[PDB]
């Protein structure tokens, strides 16, 4: 089923080069393209028969970059695997439907992958899990902490500091995907966006400077930053 298509401007942003280190990609530049959403797949054209590339976008995540520098229009896509592309649209608003479309093909997918028909209930489901997710391991990681800030023996000390460590990721797994789902949410529902501000508040000062070697900190770089970790 195919749900756009048009032309956009292409430069993909940010690989996961091997051994899981993230790369600022090739500076390459803005090339066209005729791009066709059929189901949760890009496919790219470089004449108004044959895909030049094509790009799965399953569990995606995009965003508006109106801060860019040069260009107007542009919006990021980050797919479930550390990946990271540029694109730019015609107008303000075919930017805006080229979003929800993507959005919306993603929260289709993710409702059938998962058994289920309504899709707005699930989406909705996954929110109020994450939450009570978060708030668990949120204790979690200050249980550790309002502890071993006590046992001041350096054998076990840093010992702990690795389930802290740990922990404090497994939030940035779970504040991602509930932005993710909040994303789905309002390209479904019309809403605004989820506000990328409140998601990038939670950023471990670890990963802050990880994602310091991959241009500035961004929602997208972020989402690169967690897939990575992804098995």
């Given at each position: 089923?195919?749900?756009?298509?048009?032309?956009?401007?292409?430069?993909?942003?940010?690989?996961?080069?091997?051994?899981?280190?993230?790369?600022?990609?090739?500076?390459?530049?803005?090339?066209?393209?005729?791009?066709?959403?059929?189901?949760c797949t890009l496919l790219f054209y470089e004449t108004y028969s044959a895909p030049r590339c094509a790009l799965f976008a399953e569990d995606s995540i995009v965003q508006s970059v109106p801060e860019h520098p040069k260009k107007e229009h542009v919006f990021c896509l980050s797919n479930s695997c550390g990946d990271v592309y540029l694109f730019q649209a015609t107008s303000q608003t075919d930017l805006e439907n080229?979003?929800?479309?993507?959005?919306?093909?993603?929260?289709?997918?993710?409702?059938?992958?998962?058994?289920?028909?309504?899709?707005?209930?699930?989406?909705?489901?996954?929110?109020?899990?994450?939450?009570?997710?978060?708030?668990?391991?949120?204790?979690?990681?200050?249980?550790?902490?309002?502890?071993l800030s006590v046992v001041s023996d350096p054998k076990n000390r840093k010992a702990i500091e690795n389930q802290i460590r740990?922990?404090?990721?497994?939030?940035?797994?779970?504040?991602?995907?509930l932005f993710?789902?909040?994303?789905?949410?309002?390209?479904?529902?019309?809403?605004?966006?989820?506000?990328?501000?409140?998601?990038?508040?939670?950023?471990?000062?670890?990963?802050k400077l990880a994602l310091g070697r991959l241009g500035v900190l961004s929602v997208s770089s972020f989402h690169a930053l967690v897939c990575s970790r992804d098995d």
């Open positions: 089923v195919v749900r756009k298509a048009g032309w956009l401007f292409f430069k993909p942003l940010v690989t996961l080069q091997k051994e899981r280190k993230l790369e600022l990609v090739a500076r390459r530049k803005w090339k066209q393209y005729w791009v066709t959403l059929k189901g080229w979003v929800t479309a993507i959005h919306s093909a993603c929260a289709s997918l993710f409702a059938k992958k998962h058994g289920k028909e309504d899709t707005v209930r699930l989406l909705k489901s996954q929110t109020r899990s994450l939450l009570q997710k978060i708030d668990m391991d949120s204790k979690m990681k200050k249980m550790a902490e309002l502890q740990q922990w404090e990721q497994n939030l940035e797994k779970f504040h991602m995907d993710r789902m909040r994303c789905y949410l309002a390209s479904l529902q019309g809403g605004e966006l989820p506000n990328p501000k409140s998601l990038l508040a939670a950023t471990s000062r670890p990963s």
